[PDB]
Paper text:
The C-terminal high intrinsic disorder region (C-IDR) is partially conserved and packaged in the lumen of the virion, supported by the helical ssRNA scaffold. Here, we show that we can control the shape, size, RNA encapsidation ability, symmetry, stability and surface functionalization of nanoparticles through structure-based design of CP from [name] Y ([name]).
Cryo-EM 2D class averages showed that most of these particles had a cubic shape. 3D reconstruction of trCPK176C with an overall resolution of 3.0 Å revealed the cubes consisted of six orthogonally arranged rings, with no additional stacking of rings as found in trCPE150C. The center of each octameric ring contained a blob of density, which disappeared after removal of the His6-tags (trCPK176C-noHis) without affecting the cubic architecture. Another blob of density was observed in the center of all cubic assemblies, indicating the presence of putative cargo. In summary, the cubic assemblies of selected P-side trCP mutants are composed exclusively of CP-derived units.
Author numbering:
A (entry chain Aa), D (entry chain Al): 53 to 222
B (entry chain Ah), C (entry chain Am), E (entry chain Ao): 55 to 222
Write the structure that this text describes.
Amino acid sequence: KMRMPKSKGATVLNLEHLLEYAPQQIDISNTRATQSQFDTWYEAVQLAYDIGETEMPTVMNGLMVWCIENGTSPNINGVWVMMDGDEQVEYPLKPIVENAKPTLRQIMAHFSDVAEAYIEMRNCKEPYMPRYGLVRNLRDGSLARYAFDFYEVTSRTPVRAREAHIQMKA
Amino acid sequence: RMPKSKGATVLNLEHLLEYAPQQIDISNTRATQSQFDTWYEAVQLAYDIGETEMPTVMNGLMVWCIENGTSPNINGVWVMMDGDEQVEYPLKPIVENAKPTLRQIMAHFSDVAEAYIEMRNCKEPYMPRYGLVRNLRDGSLARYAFDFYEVTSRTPVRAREAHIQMKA
Amino acid sequence: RMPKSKGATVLNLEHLLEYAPQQIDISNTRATQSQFDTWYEAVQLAYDIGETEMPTVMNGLMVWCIENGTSPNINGVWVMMDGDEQVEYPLKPIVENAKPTLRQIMAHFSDVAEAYIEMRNCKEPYMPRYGLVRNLRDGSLARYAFDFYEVTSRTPVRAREAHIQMKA
Amino acid sequence: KMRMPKSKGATVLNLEHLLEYAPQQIDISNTRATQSQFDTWYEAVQLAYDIGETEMPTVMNGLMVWCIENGTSPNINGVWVMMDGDEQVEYPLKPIVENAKPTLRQIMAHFSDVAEAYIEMRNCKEPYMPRYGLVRNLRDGSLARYAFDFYEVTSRTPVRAREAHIQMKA
Amino acid sequence: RMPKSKGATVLNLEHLLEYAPQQIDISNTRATQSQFDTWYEAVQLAYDIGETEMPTVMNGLMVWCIENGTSPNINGVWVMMDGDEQVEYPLKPIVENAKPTLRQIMAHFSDVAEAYIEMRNCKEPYMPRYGLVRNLRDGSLARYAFDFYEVTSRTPVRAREAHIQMKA
């Protein structure tokens, strides 16, 4: 029979709750930073950039698209750019990386679902393979919604996509 | 040729005939009960939690160590979900007091972890992240996809081969 | 062509779009909650047992009705094992108060019965006697081998074929 | 997710005990009479036969071997015989059948394990196919330990034996 | 799992090991000795014959019931040949006192009937009329061609198949 864990003759697990405890893999995964680590980061960039509680969403839109075509391991001393119409708005990367615990990739993994959605609509007008796949010989175009560094391989990910990431990685 | 010292065996074949310890109680792949109790009673004190809800916390920790592993960052935190909310706990007591290794201390959950990784496969496919990261493509072996599994004589040969594949 | 009486639909498509009842809550293959509560609260009174140990009795009854069936002899007794000892209970409250049929009242255990018929297959092969009497030779379908299983949209086609084989 | 049974918001099952409740199939099966129904029968035959608390075992040995070679549905008005050396000791069947609840087959199913053991040793000297298989064209000799009316098909029974019983039955 | 009532087996395995009754003494296909004696001592009285010549009469009756059968007309007569002459006897005592059935009472002659149906095959072919009427075309199975044969573990498979052919 199964040998349930016991300390001093008492099961150390609650079975009424284990049967009804089905966490989504992403919530307890370690490829994504905790929402308590995202909130600290998010608020930190609002403080460094002096952007108000409004307009931050639009700065996060530039970073998301910027982090798809550039990567989530940039230089702490550089500047990421977002297009304000036709011009170029450069922001410092120090708050982005200095306050990204444990790493920016895990902080940016919160955008994974939106990231693939953004690529599809972009790909729904003309070809758009994110640079993370162009500099890694990702040639199939259908698997272009998974060509970004901060993608979270979950139980719902196509197996191909999973194999492709094994290819882009090294 | 029975062992002997001074014209007397140094064994009792009466006892032995009926001495049959299960492999998971003699094996070193799993911490001793005295070690498990010490770890459990130290995590209980370090978390300011009583017996009323400590078992509930252990449900989350097991489910975390199925999806993350038994070699985490000591200066970190393990996550539990209280519904849609997130519950964060330190990993200092978990790793500091888990002698010899947290895997040996978590090997006591091998049977329950096996149940919960198939109890969540019913209804919908589910696969731990110790198999999704280690390139496992067979759902029938999802039961055995966690670091602290106890390989015994009852393990399927196919299961005992996924582990050497995932472990390398 | 939407139904109508007097120039007005007799339906609300707003509601409907988001009205999605699970099949095992609308289906008649399973007794209603008000019927389950009446049966449970009648068996509890007819057995001189409180909430402290009534759940324990229900563990035995489910395991009996997996191995015997849901059409027993009303003037009989269902057996429970308190270790090596035998515990005998009447089947008058079980069948008398189970409206409409005990199978509908036992259909609420279809999910748990499925778990327990696979939770006892781990470790050692196990097969209910509603499959050993109805000529079933495949252990992979042992989960679905009990009278009060609830056939839903999630039932495997192979499982949904064993039942029509066992049911005839 | 699994929908555990509930009455008024409380599970009607104890999960700490269900995981550790693995009854042997025979103990809760209905092909075997309850030990409370065997004890009543057993004691009844001791009262009808006037045999003491000793010597009943030897009368149960004749009935077991008699019920292998004859059947467990005899005439209530007959007499079953056991061999006392070379002679023939006839006993009335009224207490055997009148006090066999629900039926003698279920009362005699308590001897199933011994019954097959008895045949093997009998078959370990010379061929012995119980009459229940001779009058039913049971031709294979290895499956002669399952040729008796009160056999309990369990999870440990060979599948052949199971198919054979389907053949002897009708 | 030995049977038991109150923590004591209800069997003696000492005795059993050496309890080995022949099948034709426990089987119900053949009348008990007390029944045979009652029938024999009733036919003896109903025929006004002593022990001096009763065995001779039984020689004819066995040879009749090999050629006619064990289900005759009670209000009839069975024939014996005293050379070229005919000897007629009633069948009232034969059938009336043969409990439970005359076949069970005549099963005691299965061994002798087998001898006499082969002892008359030596020299010249001979076949009972329970085989000539039931379409049997093999002389090697003439031994087993009578109603009151006792099918035992020693019966040839071919012989045990003629009977089911002749019996249908």
